[PDB]
Amino acid sequence: FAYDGLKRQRLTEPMVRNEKGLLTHTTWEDALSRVAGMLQSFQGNDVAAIAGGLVDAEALIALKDLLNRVDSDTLCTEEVFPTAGAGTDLRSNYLLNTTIAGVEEADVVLLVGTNPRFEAPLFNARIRKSWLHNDLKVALIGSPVD
Amino acid sequence: LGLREIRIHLCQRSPGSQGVRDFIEKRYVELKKANPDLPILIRECSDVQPKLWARYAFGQEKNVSLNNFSADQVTRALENVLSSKA
Amino acid sequence: LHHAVIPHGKGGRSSVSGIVATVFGATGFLGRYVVNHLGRMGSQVIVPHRCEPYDTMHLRPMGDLGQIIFMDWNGRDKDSIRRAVEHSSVVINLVGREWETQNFDFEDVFVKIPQAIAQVSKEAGVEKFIHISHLNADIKSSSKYLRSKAVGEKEVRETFPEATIIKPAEIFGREDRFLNYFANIRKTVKQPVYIVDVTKGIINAIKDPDARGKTFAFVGPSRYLLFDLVQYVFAVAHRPFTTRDKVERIHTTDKILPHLPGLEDLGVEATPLELKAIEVLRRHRTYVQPAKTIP
Amino acid sequence: GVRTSPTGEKVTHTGQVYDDGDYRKVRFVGRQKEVNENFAIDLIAEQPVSQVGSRVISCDGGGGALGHPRVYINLDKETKTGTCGYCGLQFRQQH
Amino acid sequence: QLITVDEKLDITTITGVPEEHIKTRKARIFVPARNNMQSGVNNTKKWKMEFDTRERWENPLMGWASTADPLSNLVLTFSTKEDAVAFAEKNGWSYDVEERKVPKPKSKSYGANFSWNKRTRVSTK
Amino acid sequence: RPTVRPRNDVAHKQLSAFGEYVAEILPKYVQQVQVSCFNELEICIHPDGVIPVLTFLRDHSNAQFKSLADLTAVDIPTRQNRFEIVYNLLSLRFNSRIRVKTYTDELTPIESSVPVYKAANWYEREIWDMFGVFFANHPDLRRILTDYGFEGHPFRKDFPLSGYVELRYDDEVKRVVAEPVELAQEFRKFDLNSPWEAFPAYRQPP
Amino acid sequence: ILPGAAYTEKSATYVNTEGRAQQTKVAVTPPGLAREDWKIIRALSEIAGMTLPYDTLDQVRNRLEEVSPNLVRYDDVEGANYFQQASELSKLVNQQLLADPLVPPQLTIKDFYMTDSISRASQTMAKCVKAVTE
Amino acid sequence: TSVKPIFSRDMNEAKRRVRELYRAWYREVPNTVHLFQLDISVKQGRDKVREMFKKNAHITDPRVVDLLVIKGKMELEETIKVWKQRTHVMRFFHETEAPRPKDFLSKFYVGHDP
Ligand SMILES: NC(=O)C1=CN([C@@H]2O[C@H](COP(=O)(O)OP(=O)(O)OC[C@H]3O[C@@H](n4cnc5c(N)ncnc54)[C@H](OP(=O)(O)O)[C@@H]3O)[C@@H](O)[C@H]2O)C=CC1
Ligand SMILES: [Zn+2]
């Protein structure tokens, strides 16, 4: 039911600040020329990027390639993950390795610091399915959410 | 001008990546301790020929094939990159 | 940009170019090409006309349904001008007459009317204004046509400083009064320009933000001696080789104005008279070494 | 229920009206915006509520086979009236 | 008398399709998903080929949805994905193939609704 | 039963018997014979057999199918040989109809049947025009229904309903011109098929 | 501001919490002058003199395969191994747990409805939020 | 992989037909320009003929080549017998079609299509 958000508050035109400091519509040519001008004048640590929660992989690698071409490596996300130890070197560090379907094979589930009902409703529905049909045992560490 | 990132691609089961799998199992931890702030992105994918990607400054890249390499050749290819500065 | 004028489509008949253009003088020689090109890409065209609606019929097929709108207007009525321009983003003035009449002299058609359109357009907030002047426009010309063009060119610039002013040479084309004029004949150097080139330049001037505030000179690629041109026309027409003012203009050497941008500065490549002469003069044949160009 | 906008254009019963900067209103210059002024939402609201002595009533819109498919309306709630989904007539269980 | 031809079957030059609508299109080969609003499965038997969706815009006069895409409505039906792939290849379209999703066999037991000591016991009928 | 079409067993048996008769006489070419529940007989043949089979049915004393009612094609893209060529024939002597079917693809010529029926001339021109099936040894094979210079074969299932080009009069060039198609209102595709099976008798094996 | 495309308006690759790569399809095109997000960056790179080496969706997807081969294996779950090596590197540096209890950001259904920019803009979700808080 | 031929049994035979068709088209252009009173030059007409042939230079299937020649002969017949009108001949030149941009940036500015 959130799709109706796609019809509201949409960004439909490029905007740049005017002399009064206000965002104003402009052409693609003009908006990108301003961005390219600044990009050419900076290097390394002076350029950074932050990716939000809905960004796709094609955009993620395009932006990484562009910043790398000015020798920047400050490609950041908003969601933290500890980089201590192996960090993101090993995929198994940051994945749901058992898979979603694998929950139906588990005999004990330990939930830590999560409310899967609202963080991953369909994942939580798969836990309930195993709880109902496989007699799965679920333990939780954190607030006693329903 | 030097190195920025290493990526190692391999298959989880194909024999051609057996030498790479041994290297990771036995050498990656030691290599990681020596280069603590260097990204060494290991990415396993089924039925890919193993490869070693090196990314240098300003987005220049080089790839060396590790197919049917022994764990020693993998070490050598790793050293050839950890001292190169393309 | 208002949401209704964001471009959409693939630039064809049913597309939305985003242009809302009021074209004064749309029912003449140059108007029919300007409207056609606008309607080709899906522009909204407002056509104010003084003539009978029967005389605007050739403009109807040039736009998708709803894209050509016709309004009555009078050059001397500023309210009729206001009605026609108050919704447009560009106003194109092609009003002219190659002769004077009892009701409209060269001063009315090339000074008062263009200035009134420019003023009303400025008041109504129209962002782009395109005014066609003449290459040979000159206060000290022997032709009162070319004298009025100079005065009008001055007034339009003063009244609408951001107006794009375009100064063509004599334009050749199917419905011209240049090649057809010579073919109907029973020192001076000319640099005539093709109608489609002039039209393409006008359309590009609308799409080019640099065109604002500039004066262009639209001329052909080659200069000819008038005698050699008429000789060429007669040969192409397979023919054995009017007013006082018209004759003055035809005998006025085309000016050389390197300090102005031209068709090339708008992306249009000038078309040689040799490639289009037969297109115009074929109808004159009763059922060819080209003119010598000034180097 | 025709109302006009600041620009003067009549507002249709679907709420349509061109906004101030919309070029498309040039189509009405010298002509007119066709607007039906018998707003059905205002007309049905003028119909009185029908009092009935049963929990369930049927509506066919009037005229037998000239009306709409016959539907049965439950009138058990006393907070609101029963409204026909086809024709908008309202019903209420008396007492 | 027959001849021998080893060339990959390619008919792009004799179909009359404009070059733009061969090279730049992406055919999608797939079995349509069951419409979740209904339980019938009869619309999930065959393979379909559709093309990438392109721009639709509002007609200035009426607000109708206009298009410049001549393949916007083209949907082809195939008995097998091999037939669909073969058709796409000979027509020069690049394609994506999505493996058919088949509902897995479920284990159903009405008696489980009344289990003596399992969570499957239902509180209402 | 007032609403149900009555069966005709006698005609079903007669047509079945004749279908075997044809298959026995031309085994070289006949691949399948079937009689529909509304009593229409279809002979499915190898494409090499177009001329021998059609000649036999026209000339044999127990056939005498002297009239070519119709000749057409069906495009079935899922088939290796996408085009099905259908001949509908009429025998006045025996007051009967028969349908002969064969197949071809986009690159394999079919033998023109003009020698057997002069009626075939234009039907084969139309099949070439609308489907692009080439007929070998046709006296004059060329487009018949489409515009001159028209590109493509419209009746193919992968040809779009509205085509690729559209025409208008352009005043600048003073002639009718062809340009890529743009529609003010796109044709609205409807998904009509019910997700529920309608005819059990035709269910395919899983 | 560079207007990009939402997930309903592009064919883009997302990887779920299992590491499974999936791709959206274009349902409608982006509104107004908005553009496909990778194309904006590709266009920006050309204007800035550092043109990226891919011009199409398939070419930028070939680039994704160079960086991480699993990113183009659509619908497949590529297993990850070496939990033992990761656990070794996890120990060699020691951090201390804070005394704060683990509290999830969403304790009740009211927190569920608006978490990103699309749902924050949805009037339907606002109605849901109002319904459960009132 | 054994198939019924159309006219040609192999590429060498097929390419003979192609050359014969090209000669017929090459010699027909001057008559076409005069007969249809075209405003293009004989060189333009022949440059267009070459361009139409050249775009099919990668075909290696003799059956496809035969169909292209067959269709090319039909098009030539329509022209010589003046079944085409002037509009049909001039459709090869796309005079009223605006220049479609090719580079990435130009396409990016105008729309979403690749
Ligand atoms: N053609 C040429 O060789 C050149 C032309 N120009 C300029 O380009 C413009 C158009 O040229 P062209 O198109 O050949 O001119 P035309 O005479 O062919 O068309 C003239 C237009 O002006 C309108 N018009 C004339 N007088 C009046 C009036 N008193 N009140 C209202 N409308 C009027 C006419 O409308 P109606 O038909 O109703 O009279 C017609 O639409 C003119 O300004 C001309 O001077 C400049 C250089 C060269
Ligand atoms: Zn009712």
Swiss-Prot record, chain A:
Keyword hit for Oxidoreductase: yes
UniProt GO cellular component terms: mitochondrial inner membrane; mitochondrial intermembrane space; mitochondrion; respiratory chain complex I
Superkingdom of origin organism: Eukaryota
Subcellular location: Mitochondrion inner membrane
Molecular function, one GO term: NADH dehydrogenase (ubiquinone) activity
Keywords: 2Fe-2S, 4Fe-4S, Acetylation, Electron transport, Iron, Iron-sulfur, Membrane, Metal-binding, Mitochondrion, Mitochondrion inner membrane, NAD, Oxidoreductase, Respiratory chain, Transit peptide, Translocase, Transport, Ubiquinone
GO BP: any one term: mitochondrial respiratory chain complex I assembly
Keyword field contains Transit peptide: yes
Family label: Belongs to the complex I 75 kDa subunit family.
Assembly and binders: Core subunit of respiratory chain NADH dehydrogenase (Complex I) which is composed of 45 different subunits. This is the largest subunit of complex I and it is a component of the iron-sulfur (IP) fragment of the enzyme. Complex I associates with ubiquinol-cytochrome reductase complex (Complex III) to form supercomplexes. Interacts with MDM2 and AKAP1.
Protein name: NADH-ubiquinone oxidoreductase 75 kDa subunit, mitochondrial
Species in which this protein is naturally found: Bos taurus (Bovine)
Lineage, opening ranks: Eukaryota, Metazoa, Chordata, Craniata, Vertebrata
Gene assigned in the entry: NDUFS1
From Swiss-Prot, chain B:
SUPFAM superfamilies: Thioredoxin-like (SSF52833)
List of residues that carry N6-succinyllysine: K51
One GO cellular component term noted in the UniProt record for this chain: respiratory chain complex I
SMART domains: L51_S25_CI-B8
Subcellular location: Mitochondrion inner membrane
Disulfide bonds: C11-C45
Modified residues annotated as N6-acetyllysine in this record: K51, K62
Source organism superkingdom: Eukaryota
Topology relative to the membrane: Peripheral membrane protein
Broad class of where this protein is predominantly found: mitochondrion
Keywords assigned by UniProt, alphabetized: Acetylation, Disulfide bond, Electron transport, Membrane, Mitochondrion, Mitochondrion inner membrane, Respiratory chain, Transport
Database matches in Pfam families: L51_S25_CI-B8
Keyword Mitochondrion assigned: yes
Record keyword Membrane present: yes
Family statement: Belongs to the complex I NDUFA2 subunit family.
Record's subunit section: Complex I is composed of 45 different subunits.
Function: Accessory subunit of the mitochondrial membrane respiratory chain NADH dehydrogenase (Complex I), that is believed not to be involved in catalysis. Complex I functions in the transfer of electrons from NADH to the respiratory chain. The immediate electron acceptor for the enzyme is believed to be ubiquinone.
Protein name: NADH dehydrogenase [ubiquinone] 1 alpha subcomplex subunit 2
Curated annotation (Swiss-Prot), chain F:
Recorded topology in the membrane: Peripheral membrane protein
Keywords: Electron transport, Membrane, Mitochondrion, Mitochondrion inner membrane, NAD, Oxidoreductase, Respiratory chain, Transit peptide, Translocase, Transport, Ubiquinone
One of the protein's GO biological processes: reactive oxygen species metabolic process
GO cellular component: mitochondrial inner membrane; mitochondrial membrane; respiratory chain complex I
UniProt keyword annotation of Oxidoreductase present: yes
Catalytic activity, EC: 7.1.1.2
Gene Ontology MF terms in the entry: NADH dehydrogenase (ubiquinone) activity; NADH dehydrogenase activity
Record carries keyword Membrane: yes
Annotated family: Belongs to the complex I 30 kDa subunit family.
Quaternary organization: Core subunit of respiratory chain NADH dehydrogenase (Complex I) which is composed of 45 different subunits. Interacts with NDUFAF3. Interacts with RAB5IF. Found in subcomplexes containing subunits NDUFS2, MT-ND1 and NDUFA13.
Function: Core subunit of the mitochondrial membrane respiratory chain NADH dehydrogenase (Complex I) which catalyzes electron transfer from NADH through the respiratory chain, using ubiquinone as an electron acceptor. Essential for the catalytic activity and assembly of complex I.
Name of the protein in question: NADH dehydrogenase [ubiquinone] iron-sulfur protein 3, mitochondrial
Gene this protein is translated from: NDUFS3
From Swiss-Prot, chain H:
UniProt-annotated location(s): Mitochondrion inner membrane
This protein's GO CC annotations: mitochondrial inner membrane; mitochondrion; respiratory chain complex I
Chief location bin: mitochondrion
Annotated Pfam families: Complex1_LYR_2
Key word Acetylation present: yes
Domain of life of the source: Eukaryota
Record protein name field: NADH dehydrogenase [ubiquinone] 1 alpha subcomplex subunit 6
Organism: Bos taurus
